[PDB]
Amino acid sequence: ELVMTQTPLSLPVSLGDQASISCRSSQSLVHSNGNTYLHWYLQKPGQSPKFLIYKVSNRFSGVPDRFSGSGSGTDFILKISRVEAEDLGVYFCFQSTHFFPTFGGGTKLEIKRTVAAPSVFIFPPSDEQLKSGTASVVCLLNNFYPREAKVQWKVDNALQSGNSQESVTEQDSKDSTYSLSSTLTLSKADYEKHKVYACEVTHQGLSSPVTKSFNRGE
Amino acid sequence: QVQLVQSGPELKKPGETVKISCKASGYMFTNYGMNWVKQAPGKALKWMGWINPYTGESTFADDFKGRFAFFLETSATTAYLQINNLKNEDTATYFCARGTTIVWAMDYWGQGTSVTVSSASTKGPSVFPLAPSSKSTSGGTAALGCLVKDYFPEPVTVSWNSGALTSGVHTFPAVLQSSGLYSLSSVVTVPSSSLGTQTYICNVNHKPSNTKVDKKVEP
Numbered sequence: 001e002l003v004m005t006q007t008p009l010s011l012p013v014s015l016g017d018q019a020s021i022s023c024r025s026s027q028s029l030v031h032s033n034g035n036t037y038l039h040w041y042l043q044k045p046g047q048s049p050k051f052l053i054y055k056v057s058n059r060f061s062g063v064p065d066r067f068s069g070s071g072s073g074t075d076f077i078l079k080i081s082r083v084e085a086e087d088l089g090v091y092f093c094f095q096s097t098h099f100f101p102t103f104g105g106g107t108k109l110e111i112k113r114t115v116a117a118p119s120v121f122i123f124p125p126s127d128e129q130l131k132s133g134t135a136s137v138v139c140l141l142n143n144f145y146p147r148e149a150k151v152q153w154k155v156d157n158a159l160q161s162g163n164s165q166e167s168v169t170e171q172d173s174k175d176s177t178y179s180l181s182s183t184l185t186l187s188k189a190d191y192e193k194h195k196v197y198a199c200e201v202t203h204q205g206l207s208s209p210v211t212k213s214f215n216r217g218e
Numbered sequence: 219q220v221q222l223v224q225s226g227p228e229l230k231k232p233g234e235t236v237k238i239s240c241k242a243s244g245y246m247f248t249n250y251g252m253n254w255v256k257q258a259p260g261k262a263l264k265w266m267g268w269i270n271p272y273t274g275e276s277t278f279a280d281d282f283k284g285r286f287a288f289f290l291e292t293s294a295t296t297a298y299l300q301i302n303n304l305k306n307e308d309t310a311t312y313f314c315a316r317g318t319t320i321v322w323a324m325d326y327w328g329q330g331t332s333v334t335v336s337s338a339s340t341k342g343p344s345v346f347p348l349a350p351s352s353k354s355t356s357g358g359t360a361a362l363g364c365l366v367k368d369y370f371p372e373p374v375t376v377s378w379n380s381g382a383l384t385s386g387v388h389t390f391p392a393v394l395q396s397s398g399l400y401s402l403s404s405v406v407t408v409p410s411s412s413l414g415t416q417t418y419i420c421n422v423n424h425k426p427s428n429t430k431v432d433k434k435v436e437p
């Protein structure tokens with residue numbers, strides 16, 4: 001049972017910079033037949049993995065020249081030169097020299113880019129939903145960086161605690177930004193007890209927080 | 219080109235059996251191995267084993283000896299993975315991947331099949347419109363979407379205008395509520411001028427419950 005140690009777990013890298021992923025085996029990956037069966041895959045968010053590098057240093061078909069592998073014996077590197085937004089994902093080394101083939105734990109390549117402010121939108125409950133007995137209010141923070149963002153819900157100007165849920169996309173593979181939904185879920189009765197609904201957003205991109213709101217039945 | 223198309227998502231009670239299929243096309247089926255790979259949610263990739271279509275023999279990794287089997291239907295160029303006596307640890311996405319034996323590597327992979335092992339029955343989502351932020355006659359861009367609420371299990375697939383609308387779409391990761399059910403939103407940004415003329419439909423498909431829905435979203 002050889003172990004494949006892949007470092008680091010996450011690698012932040014700027015656009016156009018070089019990224020280096022190390023993969024280490026507890027025993028030599030040189031097969032007594034002379035070959036070294038060490039390979040690299042990349043799995044982009046949502047997708048199946050894609051073949052990238054075979055036998056240490058050969059690029060699979062269609063793989064750009066900015067990807068190269070090196071190393072011998074027990075120590076291997078994957079270098080991505082001049083990093084591009086599309087390169088985002090989890091990189092896995094994979095050995096098939098020894099029975100049984102194994103993957104490394106993966107390295108999540110993440111892009112650093114300049115701060116970008118969110119665009120903010122609020123959505124009242126649909127009537128279809130109200131007449132089913134519940135009410136969700138949805139606040140969208142679109143296309144921002146970094147990931148850290150604060151969303152506060154105010155209902156008739158009172159701060160809400162623990163009745164909303166956040167969800168964040170993966171980094172966009174074109175502009176490396178994130179988006180985020182915050183959802184406030186109330187029962188229809190509770191929803192109709194109040195008039196003004198607002199999310200306030202705080203973020204590194206905004207010089208001061210941005211509030212989006214609506215008045216129920218607007 | 220080489221294509222590996224897997225069957226759809228499955229929900230199964232613990233102790234049941236599941237068979238997953240992987241239809242190959244675009245190459246000589248028997249001349250390449252078929253590898254199966256497990257990926258538990260948030261976790262790394264695990265090689266399960268492979269079957270040799272040329273000799274019909276299977277080999278498994280140590281963790282996969284026993285409850286696991288690989289079958290072939292050579293005339294239909296299809297490979298199968300069967301798991302019996304299902305357990306919670308089996309909840310995962312399963313990939314077939316073609317083995318190019320000339321370098322001992324998997325080269326093309328299937329899109330993955332999600333299997334959920336659970337005592338609970340499926341629950342289809344309700345779909346609600348998230349109505350456009352602005353009116354047609356104002357400037358800049360508008361956001362609109364669909365709330366896909368209270369379903370089990372994952373995955374749900376959301377598209378816009380039957381795949382014809384792709385740019386500016388953000389489909390959020392599903393989140394659990396205290397009810398034990400998932401919800402998510404899909405949103406899209408569009409020129410607000412186009413709200414007057416373009417129509418926007420979200421197509422939601424939750425296969426485990428046989429729910430397909432098309433919701434028109436407008437002001």
Ligand SMILES: C[C@]12CCC(=O)C[C@H]1CC[C@@H]1[C@@H]2CC[C@]2(C)C(=O)CC[C@@H]12
Nearest residue numbers: 096101251268316317318319322323324
């Ligand atoms: C069994 C084996 C058969 C030939 C051999 O001696 C090495 C083993 C281990 C690696 C296997 C390989 C055949 C093809 C496999 C299964 C792949 O396609 C990926 C890993 C590969």
